[PDB]
Amino acid sequence: NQASVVANQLIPINTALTLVMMRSEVVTPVGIPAEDIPRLVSMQVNRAVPLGTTLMPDMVKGYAA
């Protein structure tokens, strides 16, 4: 079971991510892993991502693979 980066807090659109708005939890589908948690710091999202939402790389502008 691979853990992904789920939203730990209410992340609004046009806003940067933070350690507080990130956590390691199992979810579906298998998106971004919890290994690049510090690499996806202060990353602006294309849309609004609420709590309990798999963080994908396609949505994260700048983050690829």
mmCIF file of N, CA and C in Angstrom:
data_model
loop_
_atom_site.group_PDB
_atom_site.id
_atom_site.type_symbol
_atom_site.label_atom_id
_atom_site.label_comp_id
_atom_site.label_asym_id
_atom_site.label_seq_id
_atom_site.Cartn_x
_atom_site.Cartn_y
_atom_site.Cartn_z
ATOM 1 N N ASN A 1 0.860 -1.216 0.000
ATOM 2 C CA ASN A 1 0.000 0.000 0.000
ATOM 3 C C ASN A 1 0.881 1.245 0.000
ATOM 4 N N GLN A 2 0.730 2.062 -1.039
ATOM 5 C CA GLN A 2 1.517 3.288 -1.153
ATOM 6 C C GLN A 2 0.718 4.482 -0.641
ATOM 7 N N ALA A 3 1.321 5.233 0.275
ATOM 8 C CA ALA A 3 0.659 6.405 0.843
ATOM 9 C C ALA A 3 0.875 7.624 -0.049
ATOM 10 N N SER A 4 -0.167 8.441 -0.176
ATOM 11 C CA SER A 4 -0.085 9.642 -1.002
ATOM 12 C C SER A 4 -0.118 10.892 -0.130
ATOM 13 N N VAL A 5 -0.094 12.053 -0.778
ATOM 14 C CA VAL A 5 -0.121 13.322 -0.052
ATOM 15 C C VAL A 5 -1.539 13.881 -0.013
ATOM 16 N N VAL A 6 -2.249 13.593 1.074
ATOM 17 C CA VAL A 6 -3.621 14.074 1.223
ATOM 18 C C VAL A 6 -3.635 15.437 1.909
ATOM 19 N N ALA A 7 -4.633 16.245 1.562
ATOM 20 C CA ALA A 7 -4.763 17.576 2.149
ATOM 21 C C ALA A 7 -5.108 17.470 3.632
ATOM 22 N N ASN A 8 -4.261 18.062 4.467
ATOM 23 C CA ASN A 8 -4.480 18.028 5.911
ATOM 24 C C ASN A 8 -5.315 19.223 6.383
ATOM 25 N N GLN A 9 -5.494 20.219 5.511
ATOM 26 C CA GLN A 9 -6.275 21.397 5.876
ATOM 27 C C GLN A 9 -6.963 21.979 4.643
ATOM 28 N N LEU A 10 -7.803 22.986 4.869
ATOM 29 C CA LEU A 10 -8.526 23.623 3.772
ATOM 30 C C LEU A 10 -7.576 24.448 2.907
ATOM 31 N N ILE A 11 -7.147 23.858 1.795
ATOM 32 C CA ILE A 11 -6.239 24.540 0.879
ATOM 33 C C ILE A 11 -7.040 25.278 -0.205
ATOM 34 N N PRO A 12 -7.054 26.626 -0.201
ATOM 35 C CA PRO A 12 -7.806 27.394 -1.213
ATOM 36 C C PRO A 12 -7.046 27.537 -2.529
ATOM 37 N N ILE A 13 -7.746 28.023 -3.550
ATOM 38 C CA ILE A 13 -7.134 28.208 -4.863
ATOM 39 C C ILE A 13 -6.229 29.442 -4.861
ATOM 40 N N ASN A 14 -5.252 29.447 -5.764
ATOM 41 C CA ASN A 14 -4.318 30.567 -5.865
ATOM 42 C C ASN A 14 -3.560 30.753 -4.553
ATOM 43 N N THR A 15 -3.296 29.639 -3.875
ATOM 44 C CA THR A 15 -2.576 29.685 -2.606
ATOM 45 C C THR A 15 -1.462 28.644 -2.588
ATOM 46 N N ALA A 16 -0.438 28.903 -1.780
ATOM 47 C CA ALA A 16 0.689 27.981 -1.675
ATOM 48 C C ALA A 16 0.424 26.937 -0.595
ATOM 49 N N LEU A 17 0.991 25.749 -0.786
ATOM 50 C CA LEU A 17 0.812 24.667 0.178
ATOM 51 C C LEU A 17 1.801 24.812 1.329
ATOM 52 N N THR A 18 1.572 24.044 2.390
ATOM 53 C CA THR A 18 2.449 24.090 3.556
ATOM 54 C C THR A 18 2.482 22.732 4.249
ATOM 55 N N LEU A 19 3.418 22.579 5.183
ATOM 56 C CA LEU A 19 3.549 21.324 5.917
ATOM 57 C C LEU A 19 2.279 21.039 6.713
ATOM 58 N N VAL A 20 1.632 22.106 7.173
ATOM 59 C CA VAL A 20 0.402 21.967 7.949
ATOM 60 C C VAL A 20 -0.744 21.484 7.061
ATOM 61 N N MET A 21 -0.671 21.819 5.773
ATOM 62 C CA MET A 21 -1.714 21.414 4.831
ATOM 63 C C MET A 21 -1.289 20.170 4.056
ATOM 64 N N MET A 22 -0.486 19.325 4.698
ATOM 65 C CA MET A 22 -0.018 18.099 4.055
ATOM 66 C C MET A 22 0.203 17.004 5.094
ATOM 67 N N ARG A 23 -0.098 15.769 4.707
ATOM 68 C CA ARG A 23 0.071 14.634 5.610
ATOM 69 C C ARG A 23 0.148 13.331 4.821
ATOM 70 N N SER A 24 0.702 12.301 5.453
ATOM 71 C CA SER A 24 0.833 11.001 4.801
ATOM 72 C C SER A 24 -0.349 10.105 5.160
ATOM 73 N N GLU A 25 -1.182 9.815 4.164
ATOM 74 C CA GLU A 25 -2.351 8.967 4.384
ATOM 75 C C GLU A 25 -2.669 8.161 3.129
ATOM 76 N N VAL A 26 -3.246 6.979 3.330
ATOM 77 C CA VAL A 26 -3.601 6.113 2.207
ATOM 78 C C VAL A 26 -4.909 6.577 1.572
ATOM 79 N N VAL A 27 -4.899 6.696 0.247
ATOM 80 C CA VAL A 27 -6.089 7.131 -0.480
ATOM 81 C C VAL A 27 -6.046 6.627 -1.920
ATOM 82 N N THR A 28 -7.128 6.876 -2.654
ATOM 83 C CA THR A 28 -7.204 6.446 -4.047
ATOM 84 C C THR A 28 -7.730 7.586 -4.929
ATOM 85 N N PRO A 29 -7.242 7.703 -6.179
ATOM 86 C CA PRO A 29 -6.228 6.795 -6.763
ATOM 87 C C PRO A 29 -4.808 7.150 -6.329
ATOM 88 N N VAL A 30 -3.873 6.248 -6.614
ATOM 89 C CA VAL A 30 -2.476 6.471 -6.247
ATOM 90 C C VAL A 30 -1.917 7.685 -6.984
ATOM 91 N N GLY A 31 -1.801 8.796 -6.261
ATOM 92 C CA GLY A 31 -1.274 10.024 -6.849
ATOM 93 C C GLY A 31 0.169 10.250 -6.413
ATOM 94 N N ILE A 32 0.450 11.460 -5.936
ATOM 95 C CA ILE A 32 1.796 11.792 -5.481
ATOM 96 C C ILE A 32 2.094 11.070 -4.159
ATOM 97 N N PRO A 33 3.315 10.533 -3.977
ATOM 98 C CA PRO A 33 3.667 9.823 -2.733
ATOM 99 C C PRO A 33 4.037 10.776 -1.599
ATOM 100 N N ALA A 34 4.257 10.211 -0.414
ATOM 101 C CA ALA A 34 4.616 11.018 0.752
ATOM 102 C C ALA A 34 6.134 11.170 0.886
ATOM 103 N N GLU A 35 6.867 10.902 -0.195
ATOM 104 C CA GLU A 35 8.321 11.021 -0.162
ATOM 105 C C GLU A 35 8.758 12.428 -0.568
ATOM 106 N N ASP A 36 7.939 13.087 -1.387
ATOM 107 C CA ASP A 36 8.263 14.435 -1.846
ATOM 108 C C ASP A 36 7.476 15.486 -1.066
ATOM 109 N N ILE A 37 7.162 15.174 0.188
ATOM 110 C CA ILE A 37 6.417 16.109 1.031
ATOM 111 C C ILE A 37 7.164 17.452 1.167
ATOM 112 N N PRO A 38 8.481 17.450 1.457
ATOM 113 C CA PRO A 38 9.234 18.715 1.587
ATOM 114 C C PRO A 38 9.534 19.370 0.237
ATOM 115 N N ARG A 39 9.435 18.584 -0.834
ATOM 116 C CA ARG A 39 9.692 19.106 -2.175
ATOM 117 C C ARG A 39 8.474 19.866 -2.701
ATOM 118 N N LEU A 40 7.291 19.509 -2.196
ATOM 119 C CA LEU A 40 6.059 20.165 -2.627
ATOM 120 C C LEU A 40 5.648 21.245 -1.628
ATOM 121 N N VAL A 41 6.642 21.910 -1.046
ATOM 122 C CA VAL A 41 6.371 22.965 -0.072
ATOM 123 C C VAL A 41 6.199 24.307 -0.778
ATOM 124 N N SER A 42 5.187 25.057 -0.351
ATOM 125 C CA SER A 42 4.914 26.368 -0.940
ATOM 126 C C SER A 42 4.602 26.232 -2.429
ATOM 127 N N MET A 43 3.857 25.184 -2.771
ATOM 128 C CA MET A 43 3.489 24.947 -4.164
ATOM 129 C C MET A 43 2.068 25.437 -4.426
ATOM 130 N N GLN A 44 1.923 26.279 -5.446
ATOM 131 C CA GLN A 44 0.612 26.819 -5.795
ATOM 132 C C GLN A 44 -0.187 25.802 -6.604
ATOM 133 N N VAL A 45 -1.451 25.625 -6.225
ATOM 134 C CA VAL A 45 -2.319 24.679 -6.921
ATOM 135 C C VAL A 45 -3.128 25.394 -7.999
ATOM 136 N N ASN A 46 -3.585 24.629 -8.986
ATOM 137 C CA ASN A 46 -4.368 25.202 -10.078
ATOM 138 C C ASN A 46 -5.823 25.417 -9.651
ATOM 139 N N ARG A 47 -6.299 24.565 -8.747
ATOM 140 C CA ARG A 47 -7.674 24.677 -8.265
ATOM 141 C C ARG A 47 -7.720 24.548 -6.745
ATOM 142 N N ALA A 48 -8.930 24.602 -6.196
ATOM 143 C CA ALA A 48 -9.107 24.491 -4.752
ATOM 144 C C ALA A 48 -9.141 23.025 -4.332
ATOM 145 N N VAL A 49 -8.276 22.675 -3.383
ATOM 146 C CA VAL A 49 -8.209 21.300 -2.895
ATOM 147 C C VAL A 49 -8.578 21.248 -1.405
ATOM 148 N N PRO A 50 -9.754 20.693 -1.047
ATOM 149 C CA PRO A 50 -10.169 20.612 0.366
ATOM 150 C C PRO A 50 -9.516 19.446 1.104
ATOM 151 N N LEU A 51 -9.896 19.274 2.368
ATOM 152 C CA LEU A 51 -9.343 18.195 3.181
ATOM 153 C C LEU A 51 -9.762 16.837 2.627
ATOM 154 N N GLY A 52 -8.909 15.838 2.835
ATOM 155 C CA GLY A 52 -9.195 14.490 2.356
ATOM 156 C C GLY A 52 -9.264 14.459 0.832
ATOM 157 N N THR A 53 -8.182 14.893 0.195
ATOM 158 C CA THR A 53 -8.126 14.911 -1.265
ATOM 159 C C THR A 53 -6.727 14.544 -1.747
ATOM 160 N N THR A 54 -6.656 13.517 -2.591
ATOM 161 C CA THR A 54 -5.373 13.068 -3.123
ATOM 162 C C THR A 54 -4.712 14.177 -3.934
ATOM 163 N N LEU A 55 -3.471 14.495 -3.577
ATOM 164 C CA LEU A 55 -2.731 15.542 -4.277
ATOM 165 C C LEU A 55 -2.025 14.966 -5.499
ATOM 166 N N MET A 56 -2.475 15.384 -6.678
ATOM 167 C CA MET A 56 -1.881 14.905 -7.922
ATOM 168 C C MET A 56 -0.813 15.886 -8.417
ATOM 169 N N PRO A 57 0.117 15.429 -9.272
ATOM 170 C CA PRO A 57 1.183 16.299 -9.801
ATOM 171 C C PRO A 57 0.716 17.160 -10.973
ATOM 172 N N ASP A 58 -0.300 16.677 -11.682
ATOM 173 C CA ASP A 58 -0.833 17.412 -12.826
ATOM 174 C C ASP A 58 -1.525 18.690 -12.364
ATOM 175 N N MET A 59 -2.131 18.627 -11.182
ATOM 176 C CA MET A 59 -2.828 19.786 -10.630
ATOM 177 C C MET A 59 -1.831 20.784 -10.052
ATOM 178 N N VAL A 60 -0.737 20.259 -9.505
ATOM 179 C CA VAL A 60 0.293 21.110 -8.917
ATOM 180 C C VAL A 60 1.189 21.691 -10.009
ATOM 181 N N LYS A 61 1.001 22.978 -10.287
ATOM 182 C CA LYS A 61 1.794 23.649 -11.312
ATOM 183 C C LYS A 61 3.250 23.765 -10.870
ATOM 184 N N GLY A 62 4.145 23.192 -11.669
ATOM 185 C CA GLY A 62 5.571 23.233 -11.353
ATOM 186 C C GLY A 62 6.076 21.849 -10.959
ATOM 187 N N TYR A 63 5.197 21.068 -10.340
ATOM 188 C CA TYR A 63 5.559 19.719 -9.913
ATOM 189 C C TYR A 63 5.262 18.713 -11.022
ATOM 190 N N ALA A 64 6.287 17.961 -11.411
ATOM 191 C CA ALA A 64 6.129 16.962 -12.465
ATOM 192 C C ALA A 64 6.832 15.665 -12.079
ATOM 193 N N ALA A 65 6.059 14.583 -12.019
ATOM 194 C CA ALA A 65 6.612 13.277 -11.659
ATOM 195 C C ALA A 65 7.217 13.320 -10.259
#
